[PDB]
Amino acid sequence: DDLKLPRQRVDLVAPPFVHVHEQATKQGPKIMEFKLVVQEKKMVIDEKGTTFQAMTFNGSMPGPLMVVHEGDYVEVTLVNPATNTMPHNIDFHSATGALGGGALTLINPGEQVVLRWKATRTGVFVYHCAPGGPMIPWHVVSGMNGAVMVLPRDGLNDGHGHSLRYDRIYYIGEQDLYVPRDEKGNFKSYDSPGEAYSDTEEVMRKLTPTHVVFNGKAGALTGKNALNANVGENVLIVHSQANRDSRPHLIGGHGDYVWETGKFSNAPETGLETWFIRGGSAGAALYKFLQPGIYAYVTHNLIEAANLGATAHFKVEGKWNDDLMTQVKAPADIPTGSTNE
Amino acid sequence: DDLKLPRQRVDLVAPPFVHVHEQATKQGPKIMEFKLVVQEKKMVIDEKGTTFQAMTFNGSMPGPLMVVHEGDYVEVTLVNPATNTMPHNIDFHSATGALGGGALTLINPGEQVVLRWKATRTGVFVYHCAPGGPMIPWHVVSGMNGAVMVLPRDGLNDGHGHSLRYDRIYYIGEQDLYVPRDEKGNFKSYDSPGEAYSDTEEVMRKLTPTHVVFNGKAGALTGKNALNANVGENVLIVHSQANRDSRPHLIGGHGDYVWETGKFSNAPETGLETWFIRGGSAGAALYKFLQPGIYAYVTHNLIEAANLGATAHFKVEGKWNDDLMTQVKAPADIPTGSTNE
Amino acid sequence: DDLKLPRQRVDLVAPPFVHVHEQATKQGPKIMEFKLVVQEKKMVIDEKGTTFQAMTFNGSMPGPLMVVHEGDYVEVTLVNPATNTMPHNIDFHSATGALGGGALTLINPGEQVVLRWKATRTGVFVYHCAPGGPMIPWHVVSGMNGAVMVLPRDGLNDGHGHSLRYDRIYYIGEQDLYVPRDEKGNFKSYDSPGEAYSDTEEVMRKLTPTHVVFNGKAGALTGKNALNANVGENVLIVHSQANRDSRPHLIGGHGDYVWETGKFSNAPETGLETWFIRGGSAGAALYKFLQPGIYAYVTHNLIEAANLGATAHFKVEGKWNDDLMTQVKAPADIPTGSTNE
Numbered sequence A, B, C: 001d002d003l004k005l006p007r008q009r010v011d012l013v014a015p016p017f018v019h020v021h022e023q024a025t026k027q028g029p030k031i032m033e034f035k036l037v038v039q040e041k042k043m044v045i046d047e048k049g050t051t052f053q054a055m056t057f058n059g060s061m062p063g064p065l066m067v068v069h070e071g072d073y074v075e076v077t078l079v080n081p082a083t084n085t086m087p088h089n090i091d092f093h094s095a096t097g098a099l100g101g102g103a104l105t106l107i108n109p110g111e112q113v114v115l116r117w118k119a120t121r122t123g124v125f126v127y128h129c130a131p132g133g134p135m136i137p138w139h140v141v142s143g144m145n146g147a148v149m150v151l152p153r154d155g156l157n158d159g160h161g162h163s164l165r166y167d168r169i170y171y172i173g174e175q176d177l178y179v180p181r182d183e184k185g186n187f188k189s190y191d192s193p194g195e196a197y198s199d200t201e202e203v204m205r206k207l208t209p210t211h212v213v214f215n216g217k218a219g220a221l222t223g224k225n226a227l228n229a230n231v232g233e234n235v236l237i238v239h240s241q242a243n244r245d246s247r248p249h250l251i252g253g254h255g256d257y258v259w260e261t262g263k264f265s266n267a268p269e270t271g272l273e274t275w276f277i278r279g280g281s282a283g284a285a286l287y288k289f290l291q292p293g294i295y296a297y298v299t300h301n302l303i304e305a306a307n308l309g310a311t312a313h314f315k316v317e318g319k320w321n322d323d324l325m326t327q328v329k330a331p332a333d334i335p336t337g338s339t340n341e
């Protein structure tokens, strides 16, 4: 074995949560070992129960967030069980060479492969399947995409010599979906991804998703699965979109520090209302919560947010600050003596 | 009354103009009092006379620009006259908490509410109605959006320790509209917003506007309503888009200083050709005019600009500078001795 | 003649290549002389042989890249041969006044015009035809757009006082096309641009291209026309899009230094995965190749890249660096003792 570094196995966790990691570290470079297992399966993607033929890393949309530090090596075992029907591979936008690794990781059902890439570039980055040709968009918009974060060894900073530390981290993977409809407008169902392909490709061609979802379905991060926080906590929100632009916004908040292009060698922007994730990238925002209550986290095409699935909630515990905002007068009848022209 | 600051009432003016304000101020924080009255009404939105069922703040698309300074408090009386049919509210992207104020301002026809928010974040920001659910996009794309500018108390700067001062300010609100068509392709008319809803939502779902307009209609800021300027004037152009991306461009000019994400804690970019307003945001550009004549101000999807309504004009008075540009030879027949292969 | 500077004639070359130029220069300002000849012609735009009625500068999509330095004057002879059917003009986003020159360059078939503009603004910029009204988008999406680069006289820098020098430069013009289809879905053919107009405008109105291509057609820069480079070379990739957004990505690489808004008075961003060209602009990225092999250069809407034409290749010669990336284990059967749940 030429590369003589310590090895550390990481157990991935399902989004929107993130596996255990250090922000700053004084450990030297390691070989960080990850396993991704491809799973093709039918999944429910909206609140009416619509299904579609998904293809996933590790059974989730998005695939899980991987976290390493600058100078680590990332050794990924990609597994394509024989219950799957298609070949698969993986392209890390964090990696250098061989189409991000895609040219070294094509595996048929029943095979696995081991790729190592050096984490030379800091930031959050997309990873996605990319078998070749028209299969590249198809596998990605069927769900085969996630992200990796390469932290500086000293953790995050503000680009002005001040360290930034998060209390909590969430990973929001946004997915554009292209579900075929019948002549009456009802979504169609299929028995396999291969059977769904031709009709799906026709929808894809017109560049208008039927659904835009976080964490794999409409409503995934609302209701009992709202994201928790507390007043005072500095929360890092990683957002990825492997195929299509997005414009994240935290309703009732801001982006205190935003890396919209997602790369920690660049100073963040401050005090944003809405930021922009270019399709094929990950970005990140830090926000320190100042008020309790419900926050909606959306793409601020509000049609997509409210009508195609792209809303998450935060539920924030703590005490209300009437200095920042207050209801001076509750709703009341318009005074008789008013003129409102 | 706990908050013991001077109160100042502001009279709003219709876009693209902006109410009287100071750039730099040595006044301390104030409670700045604004009134917004919701008006649902049919409006003309294109040059062929197409109408649609609009919903507005203060009778205009966009709603008027509010201008305050960092550290002021903004006390907004939102009025929903009983002639309206729907509930309404307001979300300030400038504000912290309660979904931007939307969770504290839902009012039925016949009611008003008073919200106060502290202007802790500098920049230009969207405000918009957001009643809940699918009503959020519907109210916004029906016209219920505007912007607020929170200036630093020392006015604008270049991010490199130099003050910037504008001679003139204009507010360009861009609106994506989704007007239903009949089976022949003609735009449909309705007697109320409620009657228009179902057909409008179907158009919205396909994410392709029928119209993209400035100041509420195609041609609003062309012809006799071109925007005036003079050679030498430094003009601030605030641009908002509450739902959908835009790419502003001043044809024949530049953006000397551009805050495309719209937030004055970040240094502007210099010398832009075209900038980018992410849907759900406001941005701003300063330009010092150097040449007289007509300028077109567009979104630089030229299909949207020329064919869906999204062109404004500036008419600039002054003297032409032949050093910057000149017609060396006027159109003339191609010389007989020419070879043009 | 009032302007007493040396004159230099430049011979343009077809994209993706760039005419001979100096990066840094100690020559003083010159009048740089360029000729552009409009050519309307049918062109093949995809791998199935689909044609469409194009309109070009100098016979190519994009038009050729012009390169000058800050403070030069650019004297452009625009020629509209009498074999063409339409009037044409030119708008330089690099220029100040008269709608970028469009208001001084409208020429009928059989005419030519000479425009001079001073290169006061550094960066890469779009130029495009803009006759007036609905003809503006039509001429642009028919192919009448290119770019000009205005280099600082000291050449490029990193925004932190370090010079940057490229070994190679390529110009990637991306074109959104709107080809009519018949009732069966087959692309229609026409005998002239005028005959194609009405059906084309209907496609344009729905804001969804049928094709998104580099260098004028699907596959233009793949196969025998892949872009060459070598390990170690710093390559400047200029990307323009005159009408519609794009999100460039170099698969297997990065953007070491990226001016996504395209203007050299602003420091570049570092280490990008994917960048963003706002419609109506040019941007530029520098990358130093570190690995040999094939790279795909795409817009990272992968549907557009793989299915609508928007993929180029680089073929990079040199030696593989197993430190940066290696295939630890080639594809092999999943071990019997594995558990992959």
Ligand SMILES: OC[C@H]1O[C@@](CO)(O[C@H]2O[C@H](CO)[C@@H](O)[C@H](O)[C@H]2O)[C@@H](O)[C@@H]1O
Pocket (backbone or CB within 6 Å): A048, A050, A181, A184, A185, A186, A187
């Ligand atoms: O295609 C729109 C048209 O189709 C119908 C069924 O005929 O609804 C479908 O489309 C809706 C919007 O996507 C979904 O809410 C629903 O799951 C789906 O059946 C019509 O109701 C709609 O009018």
Ligand SMILES: OC[C@H]1O[C@@](CO)(O[C@H]2O[C@H](CO)[C@@H](O)[C@H](O)[C@H]2O)[C@@H](O)[C@@H]1O
Pocket (backbone or CB within 6 Å): A256, A257, A270, A271, A288, A290, B096, B120, B121
């Ligand atoms: O710079 C990020 C900064 O935002 C902070 C500033 O200290 O606060 C902003 O919001 C708070 C609302 O009170 C204010 O302190 C501040 O004046 C405004 O920009 C933090 O939450 C943090 O360091």
Ligand SMILES: OC[C@H]1O[C@@](CO)(O[C@H]2O[C@H](CO)[C@@H](O)[C@H](O)[C@H]2O)[C@@H](O)[C@@H]1O
Pocket (backbone or CB within 6 Å): B048, B050, B181, B184, B185, B186, B187
């Ligand atoms: O739907 C496009 C198709 O509809 C018609 C009327 O049949 O025109 C309508 O659409 C045009 C483009 O939006 C508008 O200019 C016009 O106001 C509207 O009636 C056809 O003329 C067009 O061919």
Ligand SMILES: OC[C@H]1O[C@@](CO)(O[C@H]2O[C@H](CO)[C@@H](O)[C@H](O)[C@H]2O)[C@@H](O)[C@@H]1O
Pocket (backbone or CB within 6 Å): B256, B257, B270, B271, B288, B290, C096, C120, C121
């Ligand atoms: O930095 C904004 C700056 O743009 C200025 C520079 O002084 O001018 C630009 O356009 C003018 C066209 O003459 C030139 O002064 C300059 O060299 C170029 O970048 C102003 O209009 C202003 O301060």
Ligand SMILES: OC[C@H]1O[C@@](CO)(O[C@H]2O[C@H](CO)[C@@H](O)[C@H](O)[C@H]2O)[C@@H](O)[C@@H]1O
Pocket (backbone or CB within 6 Å): C048, C050, C181, C184, C185, C186, C187
């Ligand atoms: O319109 C989509 C539908 O049309 C057909 C011909 O009937 O294919 C056309 O569209 C394809 C996608 O753009 C092209 O690949 C081809 O050049 C064109 O004829 C059908 O095959 C397709 O099903």
Ligand SMILES: OC[C@H]1O[C@@](CO)(O[C@H]2O[C@H](CO)[C@@H](O)[C@H](O)[C@H]2O)[C@@H](O)[C@@H]1O
Pocket (backbone or CB within 6 Å): A096, A120, A121, C256, C257, C270, C271, C288, C290
């Ligand atoms: O800053 C651009 C810089 O990227 C470089 C840094 O020297 O390299 C990056 O990629 C290389 C991969 O080894 C590493 O040197 C570096 O640590 C990482 O950001 C060059 O190719 C260049 O100056």
Ligand SMILES: O=N[O-]
Pocket (backbone or CB within 6 Å): A026, A027
């Ligand atoms: O080696 N210190 O954590």
Ligand SMILES: O=N[O-]
Pocket (backbone or CB within 6 Å): A015, A059, A060, A061, A062, A215, A216
């Ligand atoms: O299935 N995804 O969270």
Ligand SMILES: O=N[O-]
Pocket (backbone or CB within 6 Å): A086, A087, A131, A135
């Ligand atoms: O070959 N890919 O499905």
Ligand SMILES: O=N[O-]
Pocket (backbone or CB within 6 Å): A249, A251, A252, A298, A300, A302, B091, B093, B099, B100, B130
């Ligand atoms: O302010 N949120 O849509």
Ligand SMILES: O=N[O-]
Pocket (backbone or CB within 6 Å): B026, B027
């Ligand atoms: O208090 N001075 O304007």
Ligand SMILES: O=N[O-]
Pocket (backbone or CB within 6 Å): B015, B059, B060, B061, B062, B215, B216
């Ligand atoms: O109606 N708006 O300007």
Ligand SMILES: O=N[O-]
Pocket (backbone or CB within 6 Å): B086, B087, B131, B135
């Ligand atoms: O309830 N909103 O129209």
Ligand SMILES: O=N[O-]
Pocket (backbone or CB within 6 Å): B249, B251, B252, B298, B300, B302, C091, C093, C099, C100, C130
């Ligand atoms: O240059 N304006 O389209």
Ligand SMILES: O=N[O-]
Pocket (backbone or CB within 6 Å): C026, C027
């Ligand atoms: O004048 N020197 O190249």
Ligand SMILES: O=N[O-]
Pocket (backbone or CB within 6 Å): C015, C059, C060, C061, C062, C215, C216
């Ligand atoms: O025809 N263009 O490269």
